[PDB]
Amino acid sequence: FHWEEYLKETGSISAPSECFRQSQIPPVNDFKVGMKLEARDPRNATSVCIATVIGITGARLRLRLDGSDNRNDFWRLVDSPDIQPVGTCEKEGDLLQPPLGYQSWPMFLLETLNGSEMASATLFKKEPPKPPLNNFKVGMKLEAIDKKNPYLICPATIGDVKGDEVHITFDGWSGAFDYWCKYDSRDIFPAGWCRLTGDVLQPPGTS
């Protein structure tokens, strides 16, 4: 896939990077499979749990909460506020929580981290600020995560704009998995993001 040729083919423009809540220069990802960190449970934002890096993909981490099975992994950018180095939870005066389905508690936390490599505090990058305005316009193209298959990023188009929300429509598909999101969502990126970060943009659908 090549954006320049695609934009020519579809007679469209890509949304300028200034529209997204993503750093102009993508954050580098130096995490390694197996590293330990702390992550807010995707089910409960008020709960922080010990997590392990299951995989690396572009500027993102495939994560799993220690103590749970491998069916609910989630993906987070290295500059996501949902992740932090081990010890942050306690430093902020809170207590680590068990993940859903978990099966003493203090000892588990000890054993699950013992001898493990903790992701360095420097690997967690600064969260990009929210753009002051929603400058997305109907017709602009971008790269968006398929929320039903998060490991995939696909070419999309802004189908509509209302207030602080934008309608993400996936090119080539029949709206099967399109979705609305805030303009400052961390799940959308400017054209060329996958190429810069070493990920792969899925080809558009065939319809």
UniProtKB/Swiss-Prot annotation:
Q: Where in the cell is it found?
A: Nucleus
Tissue specificity as recorded in UniProt:
Highly expressed in placenta, thymus and testis. Detected at lower levels in brain, liver, skeletal muscle, pancreas and ovary.
In the record for this protein, the MBT repeats are positioned at 1-99, 104-204
- Which parts pass through the membrane? none
Entry's family note: Belongs to the SCM family.
Summarizing the function annotation, the protein's role is: Putative Polycomb group (PcG) protein. PcG proteins act by forming multiprotein complexes, which are required to maintain the transcriptionally repressive state of homeotic genes throughout development.
The identity of this protein, by name, is Sex comb on midleg-like protein 2
Q: Which organism is it from?
A: Homo sapiens (Human)
- Which residues of the whole protein are included? 33 to 243 of 700
